Structures are given as structure tokens and as C-alpha cells.
Design a binder for this molecule. Structure first.
Ligand SMILES: CC(=O)c1ccc(NC(=O)c2cn[nH]c2-c2cc(Cl)c(O)cc2O)cc1
Length: 215
């Protein structure tokens, strides 16, 4: 029987859209820092569930294990980063990942057009958008306690969508799926992933596991 699914389409806040075009359409060396930003975001969300569980242990009913998995797929050309952090409500996605102005956006674009290296992005509070250095499309699947699982998606161009996710259930957390650009397939290679995690994400306070499919 035919299933029906509600979708909502949103416009990025004007300077966020400007930042995304600047990230996509300008050449930057040091694109590898996208992964540091993703891991640091997962780490922050894991911190939130960890401390929030000291008050209310039943917040870990949706899974006790606090960790980060990296999953390259050479046939899909995707790299997926999964955490079991606190997750995002529907309103969190809509607000935190596109519609609400971020106070650091302008400063960052100014710094970057004066020659700052792209690695500075995290300090400006817009580090998520570094995903578009390497990815043509980003999907963020998320599950927060007491809310449904949602899917956010954007290929930039000024909009994003949000929908209730009817895919594979997660207990709690956030899964980011990077559909990589054709010239950025190095970030599917075991050695390269291990290299940049070692260089940039060495002191993360949760275990990270890299899952590699048999060649
Ligand atoms: C705009 C920006 O850079 C940004 C960075 C991180 C967040 N994180 C969250 O809101 C959050 C809350 N729970 N889980 C997350 C989360 C978000 C992202 Cl984008 C991620 O990659 C991993 C997460 O755990 C939101 C915005």
C-alpha cells in the first residue's frame, strides 16, 4: 500500500547561505578539518547526555554506550559519522542547522576572505558547515529522548528539508551521512581516515571505532 510522508522545506538564514556558497565555491587547502569538526560536535553531544544522565539515569534507557563510529562506504561514496549523544529535537534541527542567525557567521567570512585558514571555523560556531568542503549533499539523522527520529538534508543551494525518518531506527544520537564530491574520495580510505583522526582528534574523551568493509 502507498505510504505518505510529510516534508518541510526551509530557507537557510541569509548569511548562512552566503557561508555555504563561500565554502563550496572557493578553494581551500586543509579540507581534512571537516572530520575534526564532526567528531568535536559528537563529543559535545556525548558530554550533554553524560552530564544530563547524572540527574536522571533513565535518560540512558535509549542506550548506555557513549561512543562515535566512522563508516566509509566506497560503493555509495558516503562517509557516515554516528554518535550516541543527546540528539536533536525537530526544533533543534530547524533552529541549530539553518534558520536562526549565528553571531559568528559574518566574522568568519571576513576572516576567511582576509586569508584565514579554514581550520579556524569551529571557533566561530559554524563548524558544521565545513562538511560542504568535501560533501555535495549532507543528511543528518537524529533521535532525542521523548521525540521521534528526524532526517535533515541539504545539497546547499539555499534550502534544506526536514522529515520524520522512516528508515532504520537509532536508539538516541546523531548520524551524519556525507555524500562525498567526486574528487574527495580519499576520505573513504582507511589510512587517510586514521591519519586525520590521529592528527586532529587525538584527545576526544569517548571511544571512536572505524568500520572498514572488506575490499
Ligand atoms: C551550527 C553548528 O556548527 C552546529 C554544531 C553542532 C550542533 N550540535 C547539536 O545541535 C547537537 C545536539 N545533539 N547532537 C548534536 C549534533 C549535531 C551535529 Cl551537526 C553533529 O554532527 C553531531 C551531533 O551530535 C549544532 C550546530
Amino acid at each position: 500500500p502507498m505510504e505518505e510522508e510529510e516534508v518541510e522545506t526551509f530557507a537557510f538564514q541569509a548569511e548562512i547561505a552566503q557561508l555555504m556558497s563561500l565554502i563550496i565555491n572557493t578553494f581551500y587547502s586543509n579540507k581534512e578539518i571537516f572530520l575534526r569538526e564532526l567528531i568535536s560536535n559528537s563529543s559535545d553531544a556525548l558530554d550533554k547526555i553524560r552530564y544530563e544522565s547524572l540527574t536522571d539515569p533513565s535518560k540512558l534507557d535509549s542506550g548506555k554506550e557513549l561512543h562515535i563510529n566512522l563508516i566509509p562506504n566506497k560503493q555509495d561514496r558516503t562517509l557516515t559519522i554516528v554518535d550516541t549523544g543527546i540528539g536533536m529535537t525537530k526544533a533543534d534541527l530547524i533552529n541549530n542547522l539553518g534558520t536562526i542567525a549565528k553571531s559568528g557567521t559574518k566574522a568568519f567570512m571576513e576572516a576567511l576572505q582576509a586569508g584565514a585558514d579554514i581550520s579556524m571555523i569551529g571557533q566561530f560556531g559554524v563548524g558544521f558547515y565545513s562538511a560542504y568542503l568535501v560533501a555535495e549533499k549532507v543528511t543528518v539523522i537524529t533521535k532525542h529522548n521523548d521525540d521521534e527520529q528526524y532526517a535533515w538534508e541539504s545539497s546547499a543551494g539555499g534550502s534544506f528539508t526536514v522529515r520524520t525518518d522512516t528508515g532504520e531506527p537509532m536508539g538516541r544520537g546523531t548520524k551524519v551521512i556525507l555524500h562525498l564530491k567526486e574528487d574527495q574520495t580519499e576520505y573513504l580510505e582507511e589510512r587517510r581516515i586514521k591519519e586525520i583522526v590521529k592528527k586532529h582528534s587525538q584527545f576526544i574523551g569517548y571511544p571512536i571505532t572505524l568500520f572498514v568493509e572488506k575490499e
